[PDB]
Amino acid sequence: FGNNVKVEAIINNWAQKDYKLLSADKGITGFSVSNISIINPLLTTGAIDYTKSYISDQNKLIYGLSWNDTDGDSHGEFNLKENAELTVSTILADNLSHHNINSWDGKSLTKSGEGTLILAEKNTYSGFTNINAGILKMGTVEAMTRTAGVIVNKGATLNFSGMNQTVNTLLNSGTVLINNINAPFLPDPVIVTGNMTLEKNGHVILNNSSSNVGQTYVQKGNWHGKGGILSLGAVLGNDNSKTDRLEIAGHASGITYVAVTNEGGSGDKTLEGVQIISTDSSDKNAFIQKGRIVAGSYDYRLKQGTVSGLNTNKWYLTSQMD
Structure with a gap:
């Protein structure tokens, strides 16, 4: 009243x-x-x-x-x-x-x-x-x-x-998260239908916790990088290393920086490389390593195609001792 x-x-x-x-x-x-x-x-x-x-x-x-x-x-x-x-x-x-x-x-x-x-x-x-x-x-x-x-x-x-x-169409200048921070592991790939543009200082995060290595993000479309960052987790060892994976159904162009976090890997020699990204086709340097990747006594480097030059539409981590 x-x-x-x-x-x-x-x-x-x-x-x-x-x-x-x-x-x-x-x-x-x-x-x-x-x-x-x-x-x-x-x-x-x-x-x-x-x-x-x-x-x-x-x-x-x-x-x-x-x-x-x-x-x-x-x-x-x-x-x-x-x-x-x-x-x-x-x-x-x-x-x-x-x-x-x-x-x-x-x-x-x-x-x-x-x-x-x-x-x-x-x-x-x-x-x-x-x-x-x-x-x-x-x-x-x-x-x-x-x-x-x-x-x-x-x-x-x-x-x-x-x-x-x-x-x-996804124009990302901020954060794209595969799932909630610290949520339980996802066994099924997450399929995002549309074209990605990853702007500088933007982020696509597949490692939403330290215990979730082995998740898959699928961009069902093209992927155009403009300096932003793809974050992946991996247990860095030999070619069998457990790793998060990006799958692009179309064409990967521009530049995307790739930040890899080692979760307990002790380092090993890669015979052909650890596959981390697949594309229908990729331009030269479509992905570039962000900073140094080390596990134990091994340094890892991002490469287009395997050690012996196969599958140049896919991107790999290869190791060497130092």
Whole structure:
């Protein structure tokens, strides 16, 4: 019955189109839901709110997603505060509503703020996926098959959670994680359908913990390097060394730096080399070693093709004593 009735609405998993929060008989009680403001604790303080509250004809307060607004207030941005985690379990589709105050194309999703957004439905939106800050985390396979393209800014993260995804085009200036840091080992390859562009200071991480050597990332598309870093883990020994592996279904061009972490390998001689990357075809120096790789008494060097010159579409680590 306060003049300014403020309600905190906690929805960590948005699993319906909209939610009925409050209702009352205004004539009998004089309690009007128009006099209510809904506080969103997951929202970065002072940011555009991804929710919208509507007042029905009968003094009922409904809570909806700004994404779905049809009254000119729609937008595609989720600005989540640090340590906040929102799971969206409703389908985000293109919004045909009329041009709006936020000049939103009705198609593109923008992830902002330091928190985590989890896409748990098979969304159909066809605009870009702008990951400007924080973490966009996959909660289902094929969460955004129609996206025009995925853009990862420096300091932001795309976490596949070990689940296959279609990205179509992936412009990575930040971190692409195969799965959560310190998550259990993944036996199945993660298949990312689309073309990769790896910008300088960007990272593709296959070694998400020190005990997970032997995971496989498949870029089902081309791979164009512009100075960014591929991180792999390996138990460095002979040609049988356990290692993470990158598989590129198309053409590898430009330059990608390769950072290898030895996890307990004691070093050994490689007869032909430890295969770490496969491609349909690779340009000269498409991959270049980042820094020195040593295990025990052996130094390892990245090579295109095996010691004897075979499979020049694949990339190997070869050792020698020093």
